Amino acid sequence: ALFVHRDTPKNNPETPFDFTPENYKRIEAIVKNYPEGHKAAAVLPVLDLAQRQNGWLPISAMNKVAEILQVPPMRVYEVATFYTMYNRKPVGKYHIQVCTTTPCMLRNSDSILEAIQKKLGIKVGETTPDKLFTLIEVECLGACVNAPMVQINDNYYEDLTPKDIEEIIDELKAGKIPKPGPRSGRFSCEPAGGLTSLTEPPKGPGFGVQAGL
């Protein structure tokens, strides 16, 4: 939760980090999505790829990304401190992101936050002693009709109750992976009591095509 680096024994420029060769293929594929001379545009996906390989960013992933893109290290440090995904401390393997903005707070995300705190045995920001779970409190994740919801490393688990998030944490502690969706009866974003729209089949291609096309 700080925005400076202090060299620990486990975080320094002599901490080992390097990409796998398939990650070098992926980095070349990323850099090819950007114009020539703007190789610096690929700081964000390559540093995100470094987080996907390592789980978190020491200051050797930042320096490696700055070395391969020939940018200054400071310009990667600005990116890694600007954005809330680049984890600069080693998080747990399941990173529970509870949304607590106003549309999730109106549908009682606080009960879910208290339920995760009493189910894992931690509070906001901390990490469980098995290093599997880290619980932090994030802003709007963009699933507002499916409020309340959480995000666990990639996946939205929506329409939750306290019992639903207890059940999902239980089947995470069993080593499996749940289904990333709502936990009420609906599927994505329809009204829960039934389809108020889109009941009919679509018209097919060519419906209402004006003259001259």
Partner: protein
Amino acid sequence: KTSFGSLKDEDRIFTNLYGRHDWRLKGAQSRGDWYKTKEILLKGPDWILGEVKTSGLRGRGGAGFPTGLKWSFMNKPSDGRPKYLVVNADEGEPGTCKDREIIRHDPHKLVEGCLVGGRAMGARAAYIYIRGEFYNEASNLQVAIREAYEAGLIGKNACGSGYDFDVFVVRGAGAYICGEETALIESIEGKQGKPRLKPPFPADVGVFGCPTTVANVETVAVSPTICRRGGAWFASFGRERNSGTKLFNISGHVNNPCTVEEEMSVPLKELIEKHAGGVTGGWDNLLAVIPGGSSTPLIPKSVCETVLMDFDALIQAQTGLGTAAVIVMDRSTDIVKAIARLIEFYKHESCGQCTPCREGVDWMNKVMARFVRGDARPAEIDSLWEISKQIEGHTICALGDGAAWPVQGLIRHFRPELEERMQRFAQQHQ
């Protein structure tokens, strides 16, 4: 036509909004997507821009700028630099969860929108800046973009029209500010998502210094449906200067929090009672409504009775349309706590570039945190009004404006609840 709403299932642009059909190419071809795209593209940029300016399509991102006039700013001769369409898919707004549905469920509509829009503006390719939290949506859209390339719909010889148009997806990294168009451009350029100053508008200097149009996913994806159905058809929905259909996100305290498509000037009471199953407790349980996502001022029950859900009637109702994301709040709501948590959002998502937002939004959050407990005296409400009026209009982008507006709406409609909070604090602590 004076009555609006009751949009029928045949006039829905976003058929398969709900994921009930195949989002892939075999499903999207069965619904009108990628039909006669070659004949759209061969008719030049001028016919496309004429149909979009005919269609009355305004900005579906939330600001509501006229989309065809905006896209015509790229209709200009080449001067060595390439041109780019950039599709704003960040969607960080509380209440707003509709472009997630467009990316996840109608992706080929977005890719055809990228192709038709980039043809309208001479754009070389399309960078779709998706949110980094939308990982499944990003892989979903890359699957559909692979389906578009392997069918030859995009890329080399796009749909057999002799146009070359790539479509890229660039993933974000968790910043609400990178939905503003210039901060998004800086987030593409491998930098901090700090907004640029206008002018240069992105049609002059945009992504990588090139001419650029940044448009929302909704106002990009509805463009081939406009260019197929015609302009005046889409213009025949909603009031004048409010032409068309709109995806509404009725969130909050309703029985059925849902995303639905409806005509542009539908009544708010009719929308909540007809698609969301009403407020939890009926219409007599409503307290306030944040009509279009977090950056718009709330309005109480006496205004939400007769109000229309478009740009002009909500500006006359001293708020804005915005993203058309309806946040419904009942009588069981600590409303000052809700607006203070919303200001807490707008300081945790604020890039710290210019002075008034960087300092004043934190200062408004501290004042609102004392207002929740009541730890203040009633001069500070007017003080907070003046702080919000000093933030409003003095910033680089409208996050300062979009942060000052919930404070001004809360004060303007619920000054007495703040005053009675503070006076019961003053009696019980002294």
